[PDB]
Amino acid sequence: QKVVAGYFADWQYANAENPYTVKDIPADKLTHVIYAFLSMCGPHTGASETVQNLVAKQCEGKDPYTAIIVDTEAALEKNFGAVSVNVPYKGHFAQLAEMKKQHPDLKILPSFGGWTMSEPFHAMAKNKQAMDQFSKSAVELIAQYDFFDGIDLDWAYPGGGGLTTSPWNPDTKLSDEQKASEREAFTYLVKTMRAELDELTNQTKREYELSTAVGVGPKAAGIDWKAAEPYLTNMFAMTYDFLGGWGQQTGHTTNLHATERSWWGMGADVFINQMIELGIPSEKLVIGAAFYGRGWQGTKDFSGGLPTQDLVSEQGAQFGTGENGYFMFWDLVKNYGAKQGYEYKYDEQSQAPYLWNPEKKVFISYEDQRSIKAKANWAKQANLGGIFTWELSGDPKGELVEVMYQEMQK
Numbered sequence: 001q002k003v004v005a006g007y008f009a010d011w012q013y014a015n016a017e018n019p020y021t022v023k024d025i026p027a028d029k030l031t032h033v034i035y036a037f038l039s040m041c042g043p044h045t046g047a048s049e050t051v052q053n054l055v056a057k058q059c060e061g062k063d064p065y066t067a068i069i070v071d072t073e074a075a076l077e078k079n080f081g082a083v084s085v086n087v088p089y090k091g092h093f094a095q096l097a098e099m100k101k102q103h104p105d106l107k108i109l110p111s112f113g114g115w116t117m118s119e120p121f122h123a124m125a126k127n128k129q130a131m132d133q134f135s136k137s138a139v140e141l142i143a144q145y146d147f148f149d150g151i152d153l154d155w156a157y158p159g160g161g162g163l164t165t166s167p168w169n170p171d172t173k174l175s176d177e178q179k180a181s182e183r184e185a186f187t188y189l190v191k192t193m194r195a196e197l198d199e200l201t202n203q204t205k206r207e208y209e210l211s212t213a214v215g216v217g218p219k220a221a222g223i224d225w226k227a228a229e230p231y232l233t234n235m236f237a238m239t240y241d242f243l244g245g246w247g248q249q250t251g252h253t254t255n256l257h258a259t260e261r262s263w264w265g266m267g268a269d270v271f272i273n274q275m276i277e278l279g280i281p282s283e284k285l286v287i288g289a290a291f292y293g294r295g296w297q298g299t300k301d302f303s304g305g306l307p308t309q310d311l312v313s314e315q316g317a318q319f320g321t322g323e324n325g326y327f328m329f330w331d332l333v334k335n336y337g338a339k340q341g342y343e344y345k346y347d348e349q350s351q352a353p354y355l356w357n358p359e360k361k362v363f364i365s366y367e368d369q370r371s372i373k374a375k376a377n378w379a380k381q382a383n384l385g386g387i388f389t390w391e392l393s394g395d396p397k398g399e400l401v402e403v404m405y406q407e408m409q410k
């Protein structure tokens, strides 16, 4: 029984072209659904205005660093349809409670953080009392919403490299002292959260999981894994976003294998191996698959061959499924295929698919059945814990999940 996990983005239902809800999740093919994202009462200056307003609203009457539902309309209020369970809310959470009823062996986790809401962790990590309050209140939150099976932490990232903590910019790069403080704080956080969950177990007699995302390369090495790992169930390795429309460097976003043609030698295999070397047990590690792609326009010096280690484009694509530069899998299948002038290609050495439009000079890197099969099989051979996807709505048919399930649970 390997992990076959999917993230469920709380916001995706709002796209009329793919209004994906909890009722669309292929629950019988997953071991875990992870609800993205919750946060805490702390600074969100780097998030959208929408998110900052939602947070400020929820902060009313709560202590600093209290675990919160952010989009409460999505989570609790919007009617996604009647359910058999008698719960005093609607939203996605009523649907998750129903899903748990119909699929009792599925594990459902809330994820705290994510790219745009990691910022408050940096403030929380400065004080033990802040971390205690977040731990206490996060466990109270799942105790109240008792279809949840534990807690996932998606703090991008202790030691920096996230949205408000870029090392490439002088005034956001974290100091050595702050990196060190955050290293110790992450251990304390997971120790405290694990203890709080163990107390909940003593009350309810259920087992709870505590898991975390892990960034790649230097972003993994900001945590003391030898100290932290005993507290954690799974580490979800974010083996994606290697390249993107933020830079002119063009190539694979989530390639399984590093090659001599990779930009900067990147590939999921090399990053997973580093994580194991840092002291994450392979059997706790879960490789990441993407149900989206990224793309570039005005790709230079390229005729449709294999991508190389110096491939560049004018810029990231000024087009996307919603925000520019990324594409959900379903949008790629519908709108960026052969009939639209995009040639599907597969880099066998990398195990990664890409799309090349020769007339328009557009390059897209993504993930498909072939690469997911390859990643699941590699995970098995590397004695990993399983595979997960960011995020389920990219695959409305459930066809990519089916590959994850069949190939991992094999």
Ligand SMILES: CC(=O)N[C@@H]1[C@@H](O)[C@H](O[C@@H]2O[C@H](CO)[C@@H](O[C@@H]3O[C@H](CO)[C@@H](O[C@H]4O[C@H](CO)[C@@H](O)[C@H](O)[C@H]4NC(C)=O)[C@H](O)[C@H]3NC(C)=O)[C@H](O)[C@H]2NC(C)=O)[C@@H](CO)O[C@H]1O
Pocket: 010, 011, 012, 014, 037, 047, 048, 050, 051, 071, 074, 113, 114, 115, 116, 117, 154, 155, 156, 213, 238, 241, 292, 322, 323, 326, 390
């Ligand atoms: C730990 C870590 O770094 N995890 C990574 C993921 O965070 C990351 O995926 C990105 O996650 C962002 C949130 O952290 C996503 O931001 C969402 O962006 C959409 C626009 O795409 C916003 O949109 C809807 O939101 C409200 C709520 O219903 C709705 O009313 C609005 O009309 C609608 N907005 C628009 C313009 O459509 C969301 O509010 C926002 N969410 C948050 C919490 O800020 C971002 O989309 C997502 N990027 C992806 C999927 O490519 C993944 C992938 O990079 O990597 C993990 O490592």
